[PDB]
């Protein structure tokens, strides 16, 4: 359906903007507040925009040298030729961080290609379905903040521990994928507590 297609695409873009804003990337306020009719106005979708045209490039606030692509595929299952096109465009623009949606699934050979080409080109598959909602806004998920290495070492020295002793967070879980953190990262999680007010924990990515 064309109407629900534009509604889905608008919420997709909104969730993407909220995501990379949470990742510290440079996101303008208007795209964070972009509405459905505004999403129509900037561009009906089916047999009219494109998943290649909808793709966006965002800069990192901390480091303007770093940029992140968000791609969308025009095909149901992303094929190796599309991965080749995306990574070659990344090579032409000298970028390594790229996010790629999938309409309903990914070819397993493309999964192998993703994990094989990871260090030279960091790619993350992402379901359209899971991307339809910003899961971070749920009531059950507490507030997550990615820690940096100085914070990690100062915490570890403050408690005289090792990375082994901390509680873990599986890297495949959707919140880590939302933040895009890798193995070795550690996330500070602030949550409300009905016996102390606030509670801070630290989860090591694995």
């Amino acid at each position: 359906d064309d109407e629900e297609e534009t509604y889905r695409l608008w919420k997709i873009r909104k969730t993407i903007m909220q995501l990379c804003h949470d990742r510290g990337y440079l996101v303008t306020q208007d795209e964070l507040d972009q509405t459905l009719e505004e999403f129509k106005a900037q561009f009906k979708p089916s047999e009219g925009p494109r998943r290649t045209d909808l793709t966006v490039l965002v800069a990192h606030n901390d480091d303007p040298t770093d940029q992140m692509f968000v791609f969308f595929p025009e095909e149901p299952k992303v094929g190796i030729k599309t991965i080749k096109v995306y990574c070659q465009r990344m090579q032409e623009e000298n970028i390594t961080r790229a996010l790629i949606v999938v309409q309903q699934g990914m070819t397993p050979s493309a999964k192998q290609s993703l994990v094989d080409m990871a260090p030279k080109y960091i790619l993350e598959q992402f379901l359209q379905q899971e991307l339809l909602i910003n899961i971070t806004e749920h009531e059950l998920v507490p507030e997550h903040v990615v820690m940096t290495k100085e914070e990690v070492t100062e915490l570890l020295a403050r408690y005289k521990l090792r990375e082994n002793q901390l509680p873990r967070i599986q890297a495949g879980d959707p919140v880590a994928r939302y933040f895009g953190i890798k193995r070795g990262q550690v996330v500070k999680i602030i949550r409300p507590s009905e016996t102390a007010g606030r509670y801070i924990t630290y989860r090591l990515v694995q």
Partner: protein, 48 residues
């Protein structure tokens, strides 16, 4: 048996036989369940 070795160790951290930290402070407050009791927060419900 699953929760056998979980213990409040000095510096008041909840840790297991593996020495992995489970809670930085027991019950998120480092307070035993004995002395605590019911009180009311007087500033929650009243109007501005």
């Amino acid at each position: 048996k699953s929760m056998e070795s979980v213990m409040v160790k000095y510096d008041a951290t909840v840790r297991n036989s593996i020495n992995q930290v489970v809670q930085l402070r027991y019950g998120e407050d480092g307070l035993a369940g004995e002395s605590v009791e019911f009180q009311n927060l007087a500033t929650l419900k009243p109007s501005n």
